[PDB]
DNA sequence: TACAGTTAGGCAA
DNA sequence: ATTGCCTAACTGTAG
DNA sequence: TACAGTTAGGCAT
DNA sequence: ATTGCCTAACTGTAG
């Protein structure tokens, strides 16, 4: 329905959109990890074209899409973004007001 | 022979110390993050007590521990841990002088 | 070093 | 099995 | 804003 | 399927 596979070699992931809390950049050269529920996921991908995909991906910095239909909530003062499954991450001073 | 349980509730996950790279907080309360070779686990742990376990695995920063075993190369200049995997920590001030 | 800012994990739920 | 609030202990930076 | 420092992802392997 | 070197684009901070 709606799905996407996180390219990983030796196999692929597959998952929903909405599984996905974030996505962030890993210490792996030109790796990512999703961030589900409670797995995350290292695959290649890029940051760009993931946000691109839809409109409640949003690249809220350089290193973080955030899915927005899995926000649980916003520090905008902070500018930490918080999910529904207890992680969070920070949104940049540039994207912060367009969430 | 040298395992460890990451302790994850609905189950556990049973690695061995080798197996590992490195050890780093999670954004979730209580969590940590092990690093293996090319998935990252989630589970319930202190890294205060991991360390404790043997001296391989060497406590760089408040929020990293390292295995010793698993460390590829070192830049002590910038202070990033370089490890097997291609992944990389940082290791604090007070810390680095010590691995 | 000592200082203003950050955080691992205790305590309670 | 999970989550937040708190503080003692860490962190990077300048003098 | 503009500045000194960091990094995602192109290009090569 | 993987890894490093590079730079255009981001990042936080002070004036």
Redesign the interface.
């Known amino acids: 329905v709606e799905t996407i596979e996180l390219k990983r070699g030796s196999n692929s992931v597959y998952v929903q959109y909405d599984d996905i809390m974030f996505f962030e950049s890993?210490?792996?050269?030109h790796r990512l990890?999703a961030h589900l529920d409670?797995?995350?996921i290292?695959f290649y991908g890029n940051l760009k074209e993931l946000s691109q995909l839809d409109d409640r991906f949003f690249r809220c910095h350089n290193s973080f899409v955030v899915n927005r239909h899995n926000i649980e909530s916003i520090d905008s003062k902070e500018r930490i973004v918080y999910f529904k499954?207890?992680?969070?991450?920070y949104a940049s001073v540039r994207n912060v007001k367009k969430i």
């Open positions: 890993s210490t792996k050269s990890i409670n797995r995350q290292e499954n207890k992680e969070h991450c």
